[PDB]
Design a binder for this molecule. Structure first.
Ligand SMILES: Cc1cc2nc3c(=O)[nH]c(=O)nc-3n(C[C@H](O)[C@H](O)[C@H](O)COP(=O)(O)O)c2cc1C
Ligand code: SF4
Ligand code: SF4
Ligand code: SF4
Ligand code: SF4
Ligand code: FES
Ligand code: FES
Ligand SMILES: [Zn+2]
Lengths: 95, 105, 79, 56, 192, 73, 434, 244
């Protein structure tokens, strides 16, 4: 399970309205999603047979003061089943 | 509360005069005018009691005037904007070094 | 894998009960496997440079910085 | 420790590189042209309680 | 020992008065007449040459200041001109400047065989004037192809600008250069 | 003894570095240029400094304070 | 003829007093044909003169070989208030060259009449002759000739009775090789240091005093009246196509009889050496290398010299140049590396110092050549020398940097085994001795 | 693209504008602009030492060389006028190699005294050596050396660092209006100085410290006192006179 297969299969299978941005790079596969779909996206990735993203490695914030939604919340996840890592991000503000 | 009512300046630092390069311009900063420092009477070290001693020059930064203004107005600070001075490119010719002085007067 | 771990022989001990005793035994075995890895590193240790040669990110030698402008400039910049 | 040349002259020329690199900001330097024109420290302080003994 | 700066001395200091002689005034005017009156700077090189001829073969800083005054420029430009070109002598030379030790085209035919004998006869090192102030040895700068090398150059400053000559001598030998020096001492112009 | 040294040196038993370096006689050199490394082993000294000796006054190495003069002229 | 070139006869020689056997002043000059009906040539007009110069195929004799007629035609047809100037380059400081000195010594009236002709052809009001500062006797002779021409009405107001006004002034340098470069010459004539200018502006638009100006060699100027009188077709009948005319050659070095001679362009180098110089000293088989024209062109080896012709194109095709047509001949007894190091010292000494690559690289090349003279170098330093020459070439304000890089490049190209052998012998001595 | 430094470009008439390409990009510049200025309008920063926008073009440092299509040689962008249809390349191998060679020549005789040079930390030479020529030095011969000159109590002099950019001389001649500084000699031995002993008496003399790209001319009263990275910059106005 390489990062080319994850990118292509996630494009083919995920509901379209969940992902606003998809990056494929040696720095990591990255999915950006609205805050209202984060939970469902993570549940899908955890449960689906072809992803089995079972381990949440961490959650962290990043501050971007020049942005209307200044905070970016990053979810680093791991599939021990397929020996692959995924990054899922969403933005947030102070309230 | 007490530190949210201070007056700040929003500005774009100009280019230094010791270097011809222009790669540090376009950034917008919030000057906190922290000018309350003194000398510690043991070693002569520079002491301060103002929390915003260096955050305006080390961490806080903004890519545009509008972002800095929005941040300042959301935090409630009273801000004044100083527009940066920019050079005027003028027609220059190497031929001008050898201009004819004209007929003698 | 990272660095030269793919050139090295070692086993990965795993437990069967998932309790404190299994983890103690795993740590003992991991020490044994670490000893194995150290022996292999000692025997396979090659000669050559210990710093990346890209002269924009690594300190020059003390003698180079005292002898060469480019080196001095890079040392000043780096530190 | 600060060192001297065998002549007795100080080695330090107040370049301030050590002050810049110090991860703990434990070095404080002031400098000026000495009476003979030499570039030398007037002040060189190390806070031994800030220092992390890293050797940088 | 040419240097790109001046250190004051008793025979070489700005306060010493220096002006073109009355007899040189005709020549200065004729030199100026060759160029538009707002382009007087063009005369710096011939005027510097005339001043060097008048001052016995060298240019004190006062002469440079006087030339700068004639052409109406800051003295720094005249200093630049005087230091850029090798024909100007900014230290004292003898009444007869002997130029030896040529360059590439003549050392193929053995040019470096004349200088040492010249110092040995003159009893001086290169660049210093003799006690009687008659001879000084300098660096020759070469023209031509140096067929009839070795060659030396004699600059005659003994009679100001009206007696100035700048001549090249060919097939000069250690015996012949001493003979040339002897005729120069006795006043006869050596053949060339 | 000067104002510079008095800012840090509070002991007068020993000579200051400024006086100590001034007591070292200028090193005579055959030539108009000399390179100073501050040590017999260059890697243990200071970055190499090339010093012109055209002036009559002794020329000072800006790193170690050693002084050099032209031996003949 | 079209097949072989050389053996120029006396009836086709332009510089008929080159050997100084007759009076060089006005009476002898007219007796030899100078100042003959110059009024008619002037009254023919600028356009006719320019067209004849273009038809003659004359190319610049100062080294670059630019077509003279086109260069003259670069001058403005209508004045914009500024005057037009002609500057004659008599500053030949290149080692091994004396042709312009001979022209000034023995045929000065040729130079003066050519000055007038070129000034009419350039619509110029005045001419400045910039002479080498060391040519004191030559300058005095030329000034005497100028007084003779002014007294006879050939120069000045109403020159030769043609209604054209033309002033000729004599200027001299103070011993700088770089002043031979045209823009450096203009700066020196202005009273500044001899530092070349960047182009653009070109001198035809802003030259002396910021006025339209043409800088051309003494040889180029002095042959124009003869070309006009005898016809462009006669001049173009000599030499190959695009290399027309006669040329002043001077041959020095290891030849039996060195001499200065006027010969047909495109003459074979070997034919020139064995015809006028008595051959290479010790025979042609003793030849090692030849520098075709002046020290500013790369040398060529013995195999190249066998068949190469002396013109701009043939020497250009073998990575060399005609230059000043100063032939320097080196036999097998010469230390070629030492000669190249000597040339490197010359270029380091003569660099004006304005621009960084020349100012520093000339000294660097000289130091490397001095080290390689005795083999005190590594084998890999030859490649470093080549790359330094490439770093200098093409990155400088003027062509002196290229002239400094070329001899080293030629040495590396044609005698690399000699340098390698010197290095190996030095290393062998180092191993056994210590 | 924003011009370098936010520089403003004024057009007398849109008819008097030409079109040039800077690395494929289309930019419009007024007639008479140089290649370097067109690069600045395009937002491309060309390295330079001898060029200064307030002083006459010199074109001697050769650090601003770029590649222009159909040009046989690298072109000094600071002096070459821009032409319509000109295709300017600044990052081709020719330009990079020219910059590397020029930087190597500049550092050849430059002294190894960054730790004692006040320009350290705000030095154009250091930054351009880090950026353009990250070439390992290979010069092993003896460096040239220069004696220091006395210019008064304001300008401290270390002439070994001078790169002969002639900015100070042109400033003295063209801005200060006091012709005291010149360039003396010829070749690698040329030295900036006044020849005779004299101090810089112009009231604008201190600006030569700003314009000198290396630590050759530095503030004597400020000598050695601080590094640029430990200084806090405040933008304000002067009250010494009524000029502001
Ligand atoms: C370093 C250097 C030295 C030069 N010296 C001379 C010279 O002595 N005489 C000369 O005629 N041209 C000399 N030139 C060439 C001139 O710049 C210029 O091309 C010439 O005056 C043109 O004359 P022409 O068109 O009649 O050949 C020199 C060029 C350089 C780069
Ligand atoms: S300031 Fe620090 S780094 Fe610089 S010379 Fe002194 S001790 Fe060394
Ligand atoms: S190439 Fe040499 S001679 Fe020509 S301008 Fe540059 S430094 Fe001067
Ligand atoms: S000017 Fe100073 S800081 Fe810049 S490279 Fe030279 S010594 Fe280093
Ligand atoms: S002192 Fe500075 S400004 Fe003046 S020429 Fe040298 S490097 Fe340029
Ligand atoms: S010895 Fe040949 S030019 Fe002087
Ligand atoms: S900035 Fe153009 S040559 Fe120096
Ligand atoms: Zn030292």
């Amino acid at each position: 399970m390489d990062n080319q297969f994850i990118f292509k299969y996630s494009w083919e299978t995920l509901p379209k309205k969940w992902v606003k941005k998809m990056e494929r790079s040696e720095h990591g596969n990255r999915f950006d999603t609205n805050t209202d779909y984060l939970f469902q996206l993570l549940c899908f990735l955890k449960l689906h047979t072809y992803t089995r993203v079972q381990v949440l490695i961490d959650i962290c914030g990043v501050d971007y003061p020049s942005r209307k939604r200044r905070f970016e919340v990053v979810y680093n996840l791991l599939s021990t089943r397929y020996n692959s890592r995924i990054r899922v991000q969403t933005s947030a503000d102070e309230v | 509360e007490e530190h949210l009512s201070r007056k700040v300046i929003i500005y774009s630092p100009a280019r230094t005069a010791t270097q011809s390069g222009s790669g540090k311009l376009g950034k917008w900063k919030i000057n906190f005018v922290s000018t309350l420092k003194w000398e510690n009477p043991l070693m002569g070290w520079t002491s301060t009691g103002d929390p915003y001693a260096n955050v305006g020059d080390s961490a806080l930064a903004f890519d545009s005037e509008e972002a800095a203004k929005s941040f300042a107005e959301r935090h409630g600070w009273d801000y004044k904007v100083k527009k940066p001075n920019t050079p005027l490119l003028k027609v220059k010719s190497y031929s001008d070094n050898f201009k004819w002085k004209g007929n003698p007067q | 894998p990272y660095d030269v771990y793919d050139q090295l022989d070692f086993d990965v001990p795993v437990g069967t009960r998932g309790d404190c005793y299994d983890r103690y035994c795993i740590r003992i075995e991991e020490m044994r496997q670490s000893l194995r890895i150290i022996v292999q590193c000692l025997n396979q240790m090659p000669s050559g440079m210990i710093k990346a040669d890209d002269r924009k990110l690594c300190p020059p030698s003390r003698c180079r910085m005292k002898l060469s402008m480019e080196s001095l400039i890079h040392h000043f910049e780096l530190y | 420790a600060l060192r001297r040349y065998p002549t007795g002259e100080e080695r330090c020329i107040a370049c301030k590189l050590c002050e810049a690199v110090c991860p703990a900001q434990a070095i404080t330097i002031e400098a000026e042209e000495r009476e003979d024109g030499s570039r030398r420290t007037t002040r060189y302080d190390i806070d031994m309680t800030k220092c992390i003994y890293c050797g940088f | 020992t040419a240097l790109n700066y001046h250190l004051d001395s008793p025979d070489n200091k700005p306060d010493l008065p220096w002006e073109f002689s009355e007899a040189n005034q005709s020549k200065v005017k004729e030199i100026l007449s060759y160029y538009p009156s707002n382009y007087k700077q063009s005369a710096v090189i011939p005027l510097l040459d005339l001043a060097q001829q008048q001052n016995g073969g060298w240019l004190p800083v006062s002469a440079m200041n006087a030339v700068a005054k004639v052409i109406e420029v800051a003295p720094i430009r005249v200093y630049e001109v005087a230091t850029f070109y090798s024909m100007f002598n900014r230290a004292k030379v003898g009444k007869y400047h002997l130029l030896v030790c040529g360059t590439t085209p003549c050392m193929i035919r053995g040019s470096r065989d004349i200088e040492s004998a010249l110092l040995d006869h003159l009893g001086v090192k290169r660049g210093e004037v003799t006690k009687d102030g008659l001879f000084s040895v300098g660096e020759m700068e070469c023209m031509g192809c140096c067929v009839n090398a070795p060659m030396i150059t004699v600059a005659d400053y003994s009679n100001g600008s009206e007696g100035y000559t700048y001549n090249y001598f060919e097939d000069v030998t250690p015996e012949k250069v001493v003979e040339i020096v002897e005729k120069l001492r006795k006043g006869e112009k050596p053949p060339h | 003894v000067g104002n510079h040294t008095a800012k840090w040196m509070q002991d007068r038993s020993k000579k200051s570095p400024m006086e100590l370096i001034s007591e070292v006689p200028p090193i005579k050199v055959d030539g108009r240029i000399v390179a100073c490394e501050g040590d017999t082993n260059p890697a243990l000294g200071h970055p190499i400094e090339f010093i012109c000796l055209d002036l009559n006054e002794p020329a000072i190495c800006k790193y170690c304070g050693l002084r050099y003069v032209q031996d003949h002229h | 003829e079209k097949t072989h070139f050389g053996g120029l006869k006396d009836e086709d020689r332009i510089f008929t007093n080159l050997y100084g056997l007759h009076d060089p002043f006005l009476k002898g000059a007219m007796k030899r044909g100078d100042w003959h009906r110059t009024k008619d040539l002037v009254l023919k007009g600028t356009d006719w003169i320019v067209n004849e110069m273009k038809k003659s195929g004359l190319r610049g004799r100062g080294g670059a070989g630019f077509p003279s007629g086109l260069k003259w035609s670069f001058m403005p047809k209508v004045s914009d208030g500024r005057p037009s100037y002609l500057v004659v380059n008599a500053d030949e400081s290149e080692p091994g060259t004396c042709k312009d000195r001979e022209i000034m010594r023995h045929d000065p009236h040729k130079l003066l009449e050519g000055c007038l002709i070129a000034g009419v052809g350039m619509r110029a009001s005045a001419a400045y002759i910039y002479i080498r500062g060391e040519y004191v006797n030559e300058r005095l002779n030329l000034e005497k000739a100028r007084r003779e021409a002014y007294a006879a009405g050939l120069l000045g107001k109403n020159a030769c009775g043609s209604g054209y006004d033309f002033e000729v002034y004599i200027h001299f340098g103070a011993g700088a090789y770089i002043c031979g470069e045209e823009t450096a010459l203009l700066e020196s004539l202005e009273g500044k240091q001899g530092k070349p200018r960047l182009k653009p502006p070109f001198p035809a638009n802003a030259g002396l005093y910021g006025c339209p100006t043409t800088v051309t060699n003494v040889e180029t100027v002095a042959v124009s009246p003869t070309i006009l009188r005898r016809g462009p077709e006669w001049f173009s009948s000599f030499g190959r196509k695009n290399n027309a005319g006669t040329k002043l050659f001077c041959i020095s070095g290891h030849v039996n009889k060195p001499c200065t001679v006027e010969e047909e362009m495109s003459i074979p180098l070997k034919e020139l050496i064995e015809r006028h110089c008595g051959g290479v000293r010790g025979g042609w088989d003793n030849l090692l290398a030849i520098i075709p024209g002046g020290s500013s062109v790369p040398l060529i080896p013995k195999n190249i010299c066998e068949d190469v012709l002396m013109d701009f194109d043939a020497l250009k095709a073998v990575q060399s140049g005609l230059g000043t047509a100063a032939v320097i001949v080196m036999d097998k007894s010469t230390d070629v590396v030492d000669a190249i190091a000597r040339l490197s010292y010359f270029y380091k000494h003569e660099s004006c110092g304005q621009c960084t690559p020349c100012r520093e690289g000339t000294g660097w090349l000289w130091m490397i050549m001095e080290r390689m003279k005795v083999g005190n170098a590594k084998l890999e330093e030859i490649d470093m020398l080549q790359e330094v020459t490439k770093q200098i070439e093409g990155h400088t304000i003027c062509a002196l940097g290229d002239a400094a890089a070329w001899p080293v490049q030629g040495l590396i190209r044609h005698f690399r085994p000699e340098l390698e052998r010197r290095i190996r012998e030095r290393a062998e001595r180092e191993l056994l001795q210590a | 693209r924003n011009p370098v430094g936010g520089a403003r470009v004024h057009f007398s008439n849109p008819e008097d504008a030409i079109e040039v390409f800077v690395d494929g990009y289309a930019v419009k510049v007024p007639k008479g602009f140089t290649v370097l200025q067109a690069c600045e309008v395009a937002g491309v920063d060309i390295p330079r030492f001898c060029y200064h926008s307030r002083l006459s073009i010199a074109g001697n440092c050769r650090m601003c060389l770029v590649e222009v299509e159909k040009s046989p040689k690298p072109v000094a962008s600071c002096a070459m006028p821009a032409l319509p249809g000109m295709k300017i390349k600044t990052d081709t191998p020719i330009a990079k190699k020219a910059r590397e060679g020029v930087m190597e020549f500049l550092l050849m005789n430059h002294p190894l005294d960054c730790p004692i040079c006040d320009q350290g930390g705000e030095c154009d030479l250091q930054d351009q050596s880090m950026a353009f020529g990250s070439d390992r030095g290979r010069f092993t011969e003896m460096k040239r050396s220069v004696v220091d000159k006395n210019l008064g109590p304001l300008v401290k002099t270390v002439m070994t660092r001078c790169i002969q950019c002639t900015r100070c001389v042109r400033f003295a001649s063209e801005v200060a209006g006091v012709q005291d500084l010149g360039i003396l000699g010829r070749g690698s031995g040329e030295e900036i100085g006044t020849y005779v002993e004299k101090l810089m008496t112009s009231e604008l003399s201190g600006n030569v410290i700003d314009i000198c790209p290396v630590g050759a001319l530095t503030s004597k009263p400020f000598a050695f006192k601080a590094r640029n990275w430990e200084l806090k910059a405040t933008e304000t106005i002067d009250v010494s006179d009524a000029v502001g």
